[PDB]
Ligand binder design. Structure first.
Ligand SMILES: O=c1[nH]c2nc(-c3ccccc3)sc2c(=O)n1O
Ligand SMILES: O=c1[nH]c2nc(-c3ccccc3)sc2c(=O)n1O
Ligand SMILES: [Mg+2]
Ligand SMILES: [Mg+2]
Ligand SMILES: [Mg+2]
Ligand SMILES: [Mg+2]
Lengths: 476, 480
């Protein structure tokens, strides 16, 4: 994946022998922003949720630093309860920095669409109709493209389409991936890079908008949320079936994965989880890995293709409309996932858990979790994704961002604090991982099947372990 | 839903105050087949498998009884084992009744496409290209319509498209069918479809649309027929055993009860009779389970139905079948075993001791969850616009009289994996969802001693479907 920026220097990084170009950020580059934002006199930031504040705030702040005349204006829908906070952050109508969504769309040369996935699906026509011809549409995530492609549609051909997507003391910040879907004049690459740099992205990786939404929507159904919830439920049931006390069962699954296993991967990667077990523990690890890799891949492979085909995005869109009454049927908002046995048990463990506790490192649990991680990697790898995307979505974000939430307060605190699309995916696919492990992986172990040494060998020697090291040095 | 038939006589049936039109079959009508099939000199049955043999043989016999000169020719690929099975049934190239699929299609006036869903999705373009102008394409299931619609496509404009779909004895005997006319380019389509159904031996033929057929069918196997029943027995077995119940008593109180006494009860006197047969304390428990499980079940059924109707689910099935083989550097992932887990190992032991004719225990809590699931499926299909005859065949009769007896005999795998690939995939995809929603929501509502939605219960007791079901049971083949 190449790109062409006339403003910024791109640097090469090598990952498992695969060269990726990246662009480093820095407040020292803010002087370069007016060059990057050529032709833009207004940036409209639509929506003020979790990204609205930070993005608008950062964009306005970095542009002032460069002494730019560019106006950062928020547009909010009629009925938004964020008008007040928008004013609190200095974005007001009298200053011309706040207004109605449509009015704001009409006047912006760059439209950053930060509204929810459901809002984008229900409003893309009106957004397109209000945008200036030849302006730029900016997305933090590629859901909309997937929605349009699921209907055989694309964006209007008169607008540029770019994406700056987040992946999560000199050098602080949050890395981003950027994509240029359409570029009507040749400014797209520089406006997306400037947008990333303006946000404080220490690193901006290159991707395609199609790969972003595929990797993102699939990743959250896999190890990030769906799969880890499924395998944790499967093992809790197995361990308790085998007589292990409920609390140690919880600690040997959730506490282990979200704590010591996560921290171990974060520091020294997957190979140091195995190397940290006793000799007897390595053997249990390999039994679990050898039995769990392909079952996990089964579901991951199925989930990826449903996301890439358009089936899953259509399902997400329709699921969202079922949250409200229609066609004479009841409303079915999302329910609670944390009121079952194992999470009521998990509530007891945490009440007396000491601070900075990391739980026991159960070799079997480790083998299952690492098998799932390696299976996700292989699926994305053979589906054509770059190592930066693969690692930054299958390893870093789960062990460094999401798993701490589970360790903190349980599955719901992790899942239901994510996007609606992610919350739906976790509920739809966690049961799938639970069943296949129980029906296949655990049957293989209970058959006393021998260890698949090809898998183990491939695990020990997988190039991704070395790429994960390089990528680790890229984190902020 | 109405249709116009010149050859056959259409009969009216009242179901919960809703009129439907049915066509009575019978050997006595075979004299009418020559006129029903006017314009047809050759019927090409494409495919063997589970339907081909029967359809071909019955059509041949019926046409001979009618003294028709129409030829039934089987279309198959020479490389299939099915080629010799057709010869073993008296279908020979040497006699003009056996040939390659493509040559058979091209020479047929009525093309009966009985190949697998997956083969249909992979070969429809070439089937269309070989069909004669103004010929008739007949389907036994509307999967192909769903596949085309999921791509914004439809059938060719220059052919008629009909369906005769077994809701399944020809030696009341036979299997009832539903029929649909999707395209009718010359006005013969309705009579050929009814002639087709009558010639199969359908005692009664119900009216539907191709769209409603494939929606109700693909959704139904993911609901109570397979996916949901599996998911609820896994959830109920896990709850019972977690509460201290013996493993074998828990298998009996779930699988054996549902597929035995409960199924026989609903089959004989319907859903209200399962309630009436309970103790006054069991009636309480039943209402607790039903009140807590009706809406969680609707949740998943509603989601599954819209996935089937939108095209999402049919495309998922097409892609799943391609993952049965190695590609893109990834392994092949055929379907796995679903019956090697604890509760099905326990089921084997139960059956090794079971007397013959054992119907198992009638656990009131189990009954409430199962009747709630079946009423929730009924509600989704009703709200989505299906007829009562389709709803009852797909949500009540097929389960209790046809599929559940397979689970009773040898466990879930013997029931699930005897069905179509599309159905086997659906079961595995959706069984986990019904288990999780029951456990996360329905069971949580019970353990909170939540109040009983008395409106739900009163609605259950007074639902018009119970009367509709009694009329539909009187239409079942043989006596049952
Ligand atoms: O859809 C998504 N939602 C989402 N939410 C995240 C989150 C929210 C609150 C606190 C910590 C993390 S991270 C993440 C993500 O990656 N994708 O894709
Ligand atoms: O796909 C489907 N497959 C299927 N298989 C059935 C069967 C198979 C073997 C033995 C007895 C019954 S019945 C049925 C059905 O209704 N649908 O839709
Ligand atoms: Mg993401
Ligand atoms: Mg996401
Ligand atoms: Mg069926
Ligand atoms: Mg079917």
């Amino acid at each position: 994946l190449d790109f062409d920026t006339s403003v910024f220097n791109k640097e090469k990084v090598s990952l498992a022998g695969h060269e990726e170009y990246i662009v480093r950020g820095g407040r020292n580059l803010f002087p370069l922003l007016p060059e990057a934002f050529k032709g833009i006199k207004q940036i409209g930031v639509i929506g003020w949720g979790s990204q609205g504040p930070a993005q608008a705030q950062n964009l306005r702040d970095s542009l002032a630093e460069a002494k730019s005349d560019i106006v950062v204006k928020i547009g909010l829908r009629k009925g938004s309860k964020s008008f007040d906070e928008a004013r609190a952050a200095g974005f007001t109508e009298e200053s011309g920095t706040l207004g109605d969504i449509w009015e704001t769309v009409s006047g912006s040369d760059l439209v950053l669409l930060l509204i929810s996935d459901a809002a984008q699906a229900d409003n893309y026509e009106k957004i397109f109709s209000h945008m200036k011809p030849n302006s730029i549409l900016g997305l933090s995530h590629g859901f909309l493209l997937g929605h349009l492609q699921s209907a055989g549609l694309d964006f209007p051909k008169n607008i540029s389409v770019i994406a700056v997507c987040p992946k999560g003391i000199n050098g602080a910040g949050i890395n981003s991936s950027f994509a240029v879907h359409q570029d009507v004049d040749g400014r797209a690459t520089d406006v997306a890079l400037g947008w990333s740099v303006a946000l404080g992205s220490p690193f901006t990786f290159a991707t395609t908008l199609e790969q972003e939404y595929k990797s993102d929507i699939f990743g959250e159904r896999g190890i990030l949320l769906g799969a880890v919830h499924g395998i944790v439920e499967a093992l809790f049931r197995r361990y308790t079936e085998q007589g292990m006390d409920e609390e140690m069962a919880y600690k040997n699954t959730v506490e282990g994965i979200t704590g010591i296993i996560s921290k171990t991967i974060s520091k020294k990667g997957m190979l140091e989880v195995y190397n940290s077990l006793t000799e007897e523990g390595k053997k249990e690890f390999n039994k679990a890995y050898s039995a769990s890799f392909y079952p996990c891949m089964d579901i991951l492979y199925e989930c990826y293709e449903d996301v890439a085909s358009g089936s899953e995005i259509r399902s997400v869109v329709l699921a969202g409309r079922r949250f409200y009454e229609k066609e004479g049927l009841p409303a079915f908002p999302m329910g609670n996932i944390d009121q079952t046995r194992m999470w009521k048990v998990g509530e007891k463990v945490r009440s007396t858990r000491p601070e900075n506790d990391l739980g026991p490192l159960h070799p079997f649990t480790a083998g299952v979790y690492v098998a799932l991680m390696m299976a996700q990697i292989e699926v994305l790898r053979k589906k054509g994704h770059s190592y930066s995307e693969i690692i930054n979505e299958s390893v870093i974000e789960s062990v460094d961002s999401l798993n701490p939430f589970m360790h903190a307060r349980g599955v719901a605190f992790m899942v239901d604090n994510c996007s609606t699309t992610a919350r739906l995916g976790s509920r739809k696919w966690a049961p799938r991982f639970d069943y296949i492990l129980t029906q296949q992986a655990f049957v293989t172990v209970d058959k006393d099947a021998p260890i698949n040494q090809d898998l183990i060998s491939n695990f020990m020697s997988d190039p991704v372990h070395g790429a994960i090291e390089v990528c680790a040095e890229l984190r902020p």
